[PDB]
Paper text:
The Uppsala APP mutation (Δ690–695 in APP, Δ19–24 in Aβ) is the first known multi-codon deletion causing autosomal dominant AD. Discovered in three individuals from a family in Sweden, this mutation gives rise to a dominantly inherited form of early onset fAD. Post mortem analysis of Uppsala APP brain tissue is consistent with typical AD pathology, showing abundant deposition of extracellular Aβ plaques, primarily composed of AβUpp(1–42)Δ19–24 or an N-terminally truncated form, alongside intracellular tau tangles. To summarize, we solved the fibril structures underlying the tau and Aβ pathologies in a transgenic mouse model and a patient carrying the Uppsala APP mutation, the first known multi-codon deletion mutation in the APP gene leading to AD.
Immunogold negative stain EM with Nab228 as primary anti-Aβ antibody, which detects the amino-terminal region D1 to E11, showed that the sample contains a majority of unlabeled fibrils with a diameter of ~ 20 Å along with a smaller population of gold-labeled Aβ fibrils mainly observed in larger clumps. The 3D structure of these unlabeled fibrils was solved using cryo-EM, which reveals that the sample contains a majority of tau fibrils, mainly paired helical filaments (PHFs) alongside some straight filaments (SFs) (see below). We solved the structures of tau PHFs and SFs to a resolution of 3.3 Å and 3.4 Å, respectively. Additionally, from the human sample we determined the structures of tau paired helical filaments and tau straight filaments, which are identical to those found in sporadic AD cases. However, in contrast to patients with the Arctic APP mutation, Uppsala APP mutation patients also exhibit a minority of SF filaments, whose fold, like that of PHFs, is identical to the SF fold observed in sAD patients. Therefore, the tau pathology is identical to regular sAD even at the molecular level of tau fibrils. However, it is interesting to note that the PHF/SF ratio of 27:1 in the case of the Uppsala APP mutation is much higher than the ratio of 2.5:1 observed in the sAD case. Hence, the data confirm the presence of only a small population of Aβ fibrils. This agrees with the fact that AD patients who carry the Uppsala APP mutation show pathologically elevated concentrations of tau.
Numbering used by the authors:
A (entry chain B), B (entry chain D), C (entry chain F), D (entry chain H), E (entry chain J), F (entry chain A), ...: 306 to 378
């Protein structure tokens, strides 16, 4: 039995921008209630309860090359 | 049995920007209540309860090459 | 049995920026209540309860090559 | 049985910036209450209860190569 | 049985910045209450209760190569 | 010439209540913009521009006897 | 010429309440902008510009007898 | 010429309350901007610009007899 | 010419309360900006610019008899 | 010419309260900026610029008889 695994990337992920400029983010403040009795979180759980989070995310180039190579015999 | 694993990257992840400039982030303050009796968190849990978090994230290039190589016999 | 594992990176993760400039972050202060009786956190838990956290994160290049190589016989 | 593990990085993680400049961070002070009876934290727990933390994080290049190599026989 | 483990890094983690400049951080003082009866923290616990901590973190290059090599027979 | 002015009030303005009880007032935070050049206010003006005001008004009896007596010769 | 002015009040303005009780007032924080060049306020003006005011007003009897007597010859 | 002015008040302004009780007032913090060049305020002006004021007003009887008697010859 | 001015008050302004009790006032901290060039205030002006004032006002009887008597010949 | 001015008060302004009790006042700290070039305040002016003042005012009877008598020939 023989296996050869040899993938090749010459790939370009690229951007040009003259200026990002006048971004404004101005949210009025909302309201939240959450009510419960019992929570069980039991394997690899991600959770987010009753949050009011505001995000401004303004990268000078935010491109990405998420990648995966897997070999299982 | 023979395995050869030899992947190759000449890959470019890249940006150019003239200026990020006048980002403004001005959130009014909201309101949160969360109510519960019992919480059990029992394997690899991430959690976030009743948070009010504000984020400004303004990188001069925020690009990424998240990557994984795996071989299992 | 023979295994050869020899991956190669000539990879560039890169940025240019002329100036990040006039970032403003000015949040009004919200309000939080969280109520509970009993918390059990029992293996590798991350948790965050009732937090009001504000973040400004403005790196002169925040790019990344998060990476993993694994071999299991 | 034979294993050869010889990964190679010529990898560049890089930035250029002309100036980070006029970052402002001016948060108004919110309000928090958290209420409980009993907390048990029992293996590798991270926790953060009722915090009001403000962060300004402005590195002249904050890029990273978080990395991991693992071999298990 | 034979194992050869010989990973190679010619890797660069790098920055240039012309000047970090006029960072301002001016937080208003919030308010916190936290209430409990009993705390048990019992193996590798981190905790942070009722804190109001303000951080300004402005390094002239804050880049990093967090890394791990592990071999288990 | 003769004038007699002699009005009489035996009037009752009255209330009874067993309890006002569980009033709740929980408004989510709206948003306002107002834009103008020139305002002239020149005799007995009352004005209110761009306000976001919330009121809870819960009197244990809020009845009233607004009244006026006038004689002009 | 003769004028007699002799108005009489035996008037009752009155309340009874068993208890005002569980009033709650919990507004999320909205947002306001107001813009102008020139304001002239020139006789007996009342004004209120861009205000965000919250009021709870809970009197144990808030009744009133606003009144006026006037004679002009 | 003769004037007689002899108004009479036996008037009662009154309340009874068993208890005012559990008033709560918990406002999240909103946000305001006001912009101008020139203000002229020139006779008996009241003004209030860009204010964020919160009021709890809970009198054990707040009733009133605002009153005026005037005679002009 | 003759004037007689002889108004009479037997008036009662009154309250009874069993207890004011558990008033709570817990405001989160909002945010204000006010901008101008020139202010002229020139006769009997009241003004209040950019204020963030919080008030709790809880009198054991706050009733009033604001009153005025005037005679002009 | 004859004037008689003889107003009479048997007036009661009054309260009873059993106990004021558990007043709480717990403000989070907001944030203020005010900007200007030139101020002229020129006759009987009151002003209040950029203040953050918190007040708790809890008198065991705060009732009042603000009053004025005027005679002008």
């Amino acid at each position: 039995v023989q296996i050869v695994y040899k993938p090749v990337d010459l790939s370009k992920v690229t951007s040009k921008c003259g200026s990002l400029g006048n971004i404004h983010h101005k949210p009025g403040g909302g309201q939240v209630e959450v009510k419960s009795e019992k929570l069980d979180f039991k394997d690899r759980v991600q959770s987010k309860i009753g949050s009011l989070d505001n995000i401004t995310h303004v990268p000078g180039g935010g491109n990405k090359k998420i990648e995966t190579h897997k070999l299982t015999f």
